[PDB]
């Protein structure tokens, strides 16, 4: 395997969950863990990042 190389698309069967924001919650995005508050972003990304 190789870790954190691309927009990963292959991994184990963990069911998703309803999205929540604006509250101090945990998160798990493609194996990226951590805690914090999620809010809408005014930034812009190139369509490969």
């Amino acid at each position: 395997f190789e870790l954190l190389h691309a927009p990963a698309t292959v991994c184990g069967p963990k069911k998703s969950t309803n999205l929540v924001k604006n509250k101090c919650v945990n998160f798990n995005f493609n194996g990226l863990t951590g805690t914090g508050v999620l809010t809408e972003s005014n930034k812009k990304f190139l369509p490969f990042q």
Binding site: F1, E2, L3, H5, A6, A8, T9, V10, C11, G12, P13, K14, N30, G31
Partner: protein, 50 residues
């Protein structure tokens, strides 16, 4: 996790990741290689060995 004990393989060892933790991480471009070797040469296939 199902493959970890479905066939009860003789040798199963993971480097850089724990076998029970393979059910959460998300990877990219998984590779697979296969061959057939004698019993003694199995112990010499681990990385960092001569």
């Amino acid at each position: 996790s199902v493959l970890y004990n479905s066939a009860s393989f003789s040798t199963f060892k993971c480097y850089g990741v724990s076998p029970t933790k393979l059910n959460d991480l998300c990877f990219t471009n998984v590779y697979a290689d296969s061959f057939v070797i004698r019993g003694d040469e199995v112990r010499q296939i681990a990385p960092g060995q001569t």
